[PDB]
């Protein structure tokens, strides 16, 4: 029912303090299920969701060996990037990598991702067509030419279309309800007097999963986009998310204001008024 699997890699060079740190987190949808850290006392892939702990030592050992080879690859990537940007040996640099696959309810590949950022800027990304690259700058074009020449896109596309989707398939089988269940938001409106003439209506969504949500204020059916304060969606700490939207309303116009909550946990959106 529209699921995705993503790996987020961070490699950080530290020229004084030894070799580079490699960390990985793996996600099914908005659920973190594995982690790896090269700075762990005995670096091993570790479960971060209950439904993955059923996998045996072979799972953890195999993945650990892969992260080790990935860390090494990233070390070489960081070295090349230093040269592309004529950077000094003294500076610490960051390579962030993200790859994964989005599948429809048919469980076949809807969208594939494979993208990199160097020192927190876009570097290179595989296009939706999984057949071409977007380079952010002239350095990233050096990488583009290499990968174009060596036809590594075809390889990537085949991984994304095949293996990625089969691992996702397996994880959904193991997850069952933990991953297929959309938890609708718990909603309420609070009233915050500003002066005797004005109050802030704050519309709340809590305990929702997944993270994707739309919160909007309407005045007599018309959208108040430019006059609505909206916090970034935030983790609650229990694998649920929170968000709120706030609008400043004149005294005695409260009932003109409707808060609208869209979430896949809701068959149809909720309309809330201050009560």
């Amino acid at each position: 029912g529209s699921h995705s699997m993503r790996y987020f890699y961070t490699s950080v060079s530290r020229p004084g303090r030894g070799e580079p740190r490699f960390i990985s987190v793996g996600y099914v949808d908005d659920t973190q299920f594995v982690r790896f850290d090269s700075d762990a006392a005995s670096p091993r892939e570790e479960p971060r969701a209950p439904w993955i702990e059923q996998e045996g030592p072979e799972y953890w050992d195999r993945n650990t060996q892969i992260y080790k080879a990935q860390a090494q690859t990233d070390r070489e990537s960081l070295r090349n990037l230093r040269g592309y940007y004529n950077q000094s040996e003294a500076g610490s640099h960051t390579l962030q990598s993200m790859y994964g696959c989005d599948v429809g309810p048919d469980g076949r590949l809807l969208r594939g991702h494979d993208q990199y950022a160097y020192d927190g800027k876009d570097y290179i990304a595989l296009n939706e067509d999984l057949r071409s690259w977007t380079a952010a700058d002239t350095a990233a074009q050096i990488t583009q030419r290499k990968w174009e020449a060596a036809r590594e896109a075809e390889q990537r596309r085949a991984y994304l279309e095949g293996e990625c989707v089969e691992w996702l398939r397996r994880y959904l089988e193991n997850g069952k309800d933990k991953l297929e269940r959309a938890d609708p938001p718990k909603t309420h409106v609070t009233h915050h007097p500003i002066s005797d003439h004005e109050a802030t209506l704050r519309c709340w969504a809590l305990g929702f999963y997944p993270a994707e949500i739309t919160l909007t204020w309407q005045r007599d059916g018309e959208d108040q986009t430019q006059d609505t304060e909206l916090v970034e969606t935030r983790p609650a700490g229990d694998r649920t998310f929170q968000k709120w939207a706030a609008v400043v309303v004149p005294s005695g116009e409260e009932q003109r204001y409707t808060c609208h909550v869209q979430h896949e946990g809701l068959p149809k959106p909720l309309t809330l008024r201050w009560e």
């Binding site: 790996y7 990985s24 793996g26 799972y59 195999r62 993945n63 892969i66 992260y67 080879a69 990935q70 090494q72 690859t73 070489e76 990537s77 090349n80 990037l81 390579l95 790859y99 990199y116 160097y118 570097y123 290179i124 990488t143 290499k146 990968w147 590594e152 390889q155 990537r156 991984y159 293996e163 990625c164 691992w167």
Partner: peptide, 9 residues
Amino acid sequence: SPRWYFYYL
């Protein structure tokens, strides 16, 4: 599981 193909930038 993480992919076991590796590509140098």
